From a paper:
This interaction site is divided into two subsites and all β-clamp interacting partners bind to these subsites.
All of these crystals yielded clear electron density for the ligand molecules with good occupancy, except for 5-chloroisatin. Moreover, based on data obtained from the soaked crystals, the temperature factor of this inhibitor was high when compared to the average temperature factor of the protein. Thr175 of Hpβ-clamp was also observed to make a hydrogen bond with the inhibitor 5-chloroisatin. In case of 5-chloroisatin, the Thr175 of Hpβ-clamp makes hydrogen bond with ligand however that in Ecβ-clamp is made by Thr172 in the neighborhood. Out of various hydrophobic contacts between the β-clamp and inhibitor, three of them are common in both H. pylori and E. coli β-clamp. With an MIC of 18 µM drug C1 (5-chloroisatin) showed significant antimicrobial activity.
Author numbering:
A (entry chain B): 1 to 147, 153 to 374
B (entry chain A): 1 to 145, 153 to 357, 361 to 374
Write the structure that this text describes.
């Protein structure tokens, strides 16, 4: 192998690969990046049986094609320290030479045959995502997922052209339903579970104009510059639809940002808050605070709510905050039944259709008293 | 007690006090700040045997004077979540109420009598510092740190304050001149602990005073008084270590040298410098088998060398010695490759401090 490349492109490509390397054992091939020059491109790839990324960059020149490997951290450490000029990369037997002008590096390669093979799939399901809504869905739901519940659910119904995205731990549950989606599939209904680990990586890599394919065991995401894959978590996600209350007794439209501030404020002294809703006021009190410690605040509700009898509700503070951080609206709807039954946080006008973005609703279990 | 205060002012004061609290045990007074309203001021104080800080802010209203205590962390957590509005602080039993419009809080106070008294000194030495040179010296020497502190040695005769830090493999020092030292002995030496040095960097820039009996340092500006205990006796004479003369002295590019070193130190802790008439060459030294990093830069202004001077140097030490300099060039003063060498500013013989560093080389 012998080529010259741009430093900015090489660097950028290297930063994204870092997260796919087991960097601690530098004597394992799991710490190395796989290189290959075909035609006027350098392909860079880091992977294991479980997750992977393949990228490419273009060459200024390409005297000689071939394969190689290199420690990912070192290679990035060296490249990030260089000037903004061409880097000559060039194999010397079992070593990779890097060169830029007066600077000269040699690094040992491993056997490129040991590098795990980058899988190809026969998709059962495939979509083209040409807007931010899916990654918007991932980003807003991720916080509820603890690393089958250890992942995000993507549920495809071809019949109805809907993709459902759902996360949960024991205590809360966020979902969204992306309607009007061009689902190409070999069944009418199929469910993939992406690990949290992969979810996070997807957020760093993709936004819109990518394809998502799966064969029911691996997912492969792809755009012009990248191909990423992950193993799926085998199993059955619980039926989320079963858990949702059928109807809600009460439905309150409230100030997102006033509620965040008042919650953050009480939660300075507690993990849980007592919410009191009245006609024209909301009251927040610290709940599980120590003997002798107390926080209280309130906000005016100018457009009166429909109650006579004042509604009280114990909530976990962080959950409630995170449910409000998943909404794009200035106001939110709180839907409840009994103070000890689950309640729901969702956007103002959540039934309305959105082009660019996902609308996440969160169902939460309250705290007693 | 009972008062109102500006939120920003209070927040600011609480932030500086955080470092003087043991926060892990909320049930100990060490997690608390001492409060006191006298006149139109609120005094806040966090201290122990070892170190302490006392601050004040002005009150917007006063009403009842007295004293109190409060958990510092919880106080800062509460305050930083309020509007910019004025805040009422009012005792109420053995509890402090905090109030801002619709928001109100209560926190338990402890007995203000268990709080250690803030010490006063009969000063053996004292100086007024109306320029940033001292803190500049402190920031520059801190990275290299009896020898667990920074030395301040006052020579009343010569009107000089020497600041010295070392870890046995390198030594950094400055001698600050033309300093109006007031003391009652001839040559006094205070050793400040690292913890104290760090806190000082956060509090003081210029227009403060520094005073010490031979046991505590107290430092004081318009908003604050800080103290720390000194480290007890016998800082080695750094002057004993300095070479008398140096064989070679080379003026060299600081930034070219940093880059070339960072770059080589990607594969090792140590580097082989080679100097020639018109080039400097850098090579990773203790890199693992078959890893290699070389680079070089041109020296347009020829160095006085017949044949190549080789010197093994510790990459991070050499970097921090260059980071401690304020000039675009630096001077490297050398004897034999096996004996210590000196890094200092170009035009070091002369607002700021100029720190020189002496380092032990690496063999082969
Ligand atoms: O997120 C949730 N997980 C649950 C499991 C059982 C019941 Cl009854 C409610 C919930 C939630 O809100």
């Amino acid at each position: 192998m012998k080529i010259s490349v741009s430093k900015n492109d090489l660097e950028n490509a290297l930063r994204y690969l870092q997260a796919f390397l087991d960097k601690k054992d530098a004597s394992s091939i799991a710490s190395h990046i796989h290189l290959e020059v075909i035609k006027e491109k350098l392909f860079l790839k880091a992977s294991d049986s479980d997750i992977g990324l393949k990228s490419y960059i273009f060459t200024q020149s390409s005297d000689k094609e071939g394969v190689g490997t290199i420690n990912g951290k070192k290679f990035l450490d060296i490249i990030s320290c260089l000037k903004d000029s061409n880097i000559i990369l060039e194999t010397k037997d079992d070593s990779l030479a890097i060169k830029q002008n007066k600077s000269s590096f040699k690094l040992p390669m491993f056997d490129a045959d040991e590098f795990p093979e980058f899988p190809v799939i026969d998709p059962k399901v495939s979509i083209e995502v040409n807007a931010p809504f899916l990654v918007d869905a991932f980003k807003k739901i991720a916080p509820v997922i603890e690393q089958e519940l250890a992942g995000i659910l993507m549920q495809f119904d071809q019949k109805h052209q809907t993709l459902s995205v759902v996360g949960t731990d024991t205590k809360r549950l966020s979902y969204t339903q992306l309607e009007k989606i061009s689902i190409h599939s070999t069944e009418e209904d199929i469910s993939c579970i992406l690990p949290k680990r992969a979810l996070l990586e997807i957020l760093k890599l993709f936004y819109e104009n990518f394809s998502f394919k799966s064969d029911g065991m691996l997912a492969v995401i792809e755009n012009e510059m990248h191909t990423f894959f992950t193993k799926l978590i085998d199993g059955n996600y619980p039926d989320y639809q079963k858990i949702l209350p059928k109807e809600y007794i009460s439905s309150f439209t409230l100030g997102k940002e006033e509620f965040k501030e008042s919650i953050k404020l009480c939660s300075s002294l507690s993990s849980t808050i007592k919410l009191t809703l009245e006609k024209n006021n909301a009251l927040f009190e610290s709940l599980d605070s120590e003997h002798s410690e107390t926080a209280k605040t309130s906000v005016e509700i100018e457009k009166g709510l429909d109650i006579e009898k004042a509604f009280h509700l114990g909530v976990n503070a962080k959950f409630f905050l995170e449910a409000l951080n998943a909404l794009g609206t200035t106001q939110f709807v709180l839907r409840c039944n009994e103070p000890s039954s689950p309640f729901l946080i969702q956007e103002s006008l959540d039934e309305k259709q959105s082009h660019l973005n996902a609308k996440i609703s969160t169902l939460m279990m309250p705290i007693t008293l």
